[PDB]
Design a protein around this ligand. Structure first.
Ligand SMILES: [Zn+2]
Ligand SMILES: [Zn+2]
Ligand SMILES: [Zn+2]
Ligand SMILES: [Zn+2]
Lengths: 212, 212, 221, 208
DNA sequence: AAAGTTATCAGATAACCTGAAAAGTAG
DNA sequence: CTACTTTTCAGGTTATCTGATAACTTT
């Protein structure tokens, strides 16, 4: 009652996931039915279906209808990097410099990939940015949502997200003119000028924050 | 093969993920009673309760039985790993793209930060690449180890940690090739920032036209 | 809702009907037999086995127990909307995104062509509508005719076929006030009595761009 | 050979549908009661209930079951490829004029990379057969389909494909490209424009 | 305490799988 | 004859429904 007791849903997982690394149901073998896990665990259809997604999501098992479920990686390959907000020098310079290659290379694609509706998102976004130059406490979201728009303009369904993450880290006129420059570059459909003024927008930012 | 379709379950989590990434549901913020999300996203709670779990496993929300679902993150369990496979040579190509973008500045930021053993690794396998110009199966464990150098030469783990993972799951699912593998060695080892970015891009983009 | 990502069954035919129309299975040819077809697209026995019979009612090919299946045509028994399903909101939001652009031109032709016989029913049904913004259910029987006879004002029986079909399934589809609805309806008529192509093109578009905004609002309400 | 066990149901069913038994909006009995009302295999049903879907009497949610949506089927024909040409065909050409109008516009606000793929490749499959115009018809076939696809709308592109299934070059291409670059520029109203000139012209070429 | 969420059980119907037993025609 | 494909059975798991019940927090 008092503390978040592990409900069955989660409990059933750590039973099964153990076996994936305890060696029982080896890699590529077929997990049992659901009707059996119900019996094996005295739980119900509903609970089973839920727990299964715990394993698909942590990337240890997959499924197709009718076949059942295939195990993949005993560990569970749920692994990437980059935190957000906790300051620790030079390792910080290992990341911004990375996005410099990234923020520029993305806008270099939108120079061949922005359409009308893409600009319409970047439109009110920078329009929402210019409307709070005196209030920089609101334009965070849009400094993202504008930076965001360059990824949405990349039309790369994957690339988009990897960017989409990076920004969601924690943390006036000199800040905003580096922006509308890459717009008149993305507006133009200009390849390297978008790859530039973007890299330069972050170029100044990464040393301006090293001065913070 | 065909593109593996998407369940309601995971299309729900992805579109709710974005609804978290666009800060519509910020941290501390409870989430709509799923009974509304059924009506909103159109399904029945069967899939709701499932998609729910996909999150609480990728670590984006928690819920307490009684007190609704609460958001507390915008980062994922790890980052994001496309499963790729036969799913979309398109969404797969949505990476060869970026894996070369990275490899643009990657060869570059080595050319300004290339050590001895860096280039002395770039050469050790460069010899084992030469003789194995007639062992096109022994010379496999070389081409990556080659590109690895550039990445390890960056002295930037994030940058380096990132690409390995990309390269890694990429291969999950020599004459003109080695000449093309070569043109960057003169580029990295001669202080040329963009010429390293230049002939390296020439590499993978030929190989992609070698594959596509 | 969202994109009811299709059944492999129908995901298949909509590559095979396309493959047929790609001519790569030029008519009179025998399709690669079932054994092959699973592996080509990567599906099971009862998918092909099904997606086949979709072509045997769509009539694209005929099958003979032993010979196999021979493409006998590249066009079906007509074109068909193929939707109106519960939970097909992305499929439905793909419907309205056409009858619109249609009912924009289905005013332009009516703006360039007409009798009074068109403007007969036009003022007739709008009158049958104006006097009946009070029993919001009987007037549904007339939003047909106004929209219907607006197409009749175009004088193209194959246009008139198109709309009446699409219109058919939406009435079947949304198997669930009248003032701001009746206004926009008249707004088309004004640019069509005074006869104006590009003026009625918009005001018609606005009707659908407003009546569907009073449809994507009640579903999530 | 008589009618298949499969069809022996489809045209046994449409009766009880059109005989108001399985009235519209009612749930079709489950794919287990049918084999148990009929004495066939449950794996027969899947085809029968695949006929009635493409025959537009029903659709089904993967849990609720199957529900009829018509009592006969409103197929909605538009047959022929020639004869009675006069302007009856030109009225068809009048229709498609607006669809080619609306469609290209929708390519300009949401085209993608896979869009400019064959749209540039069918523009390239066409430009190299300008003096072999018995070959590029298959491309003027497909080049439309290409941008027709860029709608991402199943039905839009799709029911456009069927018309091109009813039966100089240095010019009609200049109209093919003016529309092309519009979506290639993302200008939607210019997309709806630079297209139909192509369509207004080949039909003016009714004179044939 | 009662209104309102999450979590779980009870009972069920459509997709999609795998393989063997019929029923046929192209060799 | 064998060998190739088509239509059927039988026996199977997954997705996704829809209803109630249970445990718990909110108000
Ligand atoms: Zn910024
Ligand atoms: Zn190589
Ligand atoms: Zn109306
Ligand atoms: Zn043409």
């Amino acid at each position: 009652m008092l503390s978040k007791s592990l409900t069955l849903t989660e409990q059933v997982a750590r039973q099964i996931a153990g076996d994936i690394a305890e060696g029982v149901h080896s890699v590529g073998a077929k997990l049992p039915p659901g009707r059996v896990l119900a019996e094996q665990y005295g739980v119900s259809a509903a609970v089973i279906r839920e727990a299964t997604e715990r394993l698909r999501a942590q990337g240890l098992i997959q499924s197709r209808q009718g076949s059942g479920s295939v195990v993949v990686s005993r560990t569970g390959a749920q692994g990437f990097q980059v935190s957000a907000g906790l300051d620790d020098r030079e390792q910080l310079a290992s990341v911004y410099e990375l996005r410099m290659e990234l923020e520029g290379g993305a806008a270099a694609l939108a120079a061949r990939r922005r359409n009308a509706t893409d600009l319409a998102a970047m439109a009110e976004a920078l329009a929402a940015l210019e409307a709070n130059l005196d209030h920089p406490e609101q334009g965070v979201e849009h400094d993202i949502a504008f930076h965001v728009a360059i990824a949405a303009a990349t039309h790369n369904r994957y690339y988009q997200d990897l960017l989409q993450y990076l920004n969601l880290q924690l943390r006036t006129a000199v800040v905003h003119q580096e922006h509308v420059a890459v717009y008149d570059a993305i507006l133009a459909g200009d390849p390297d000028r978008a790859r530039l003024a973007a890299t330069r927008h972050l170029q100044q930012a990464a040393s301006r924050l090293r001065l913070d």
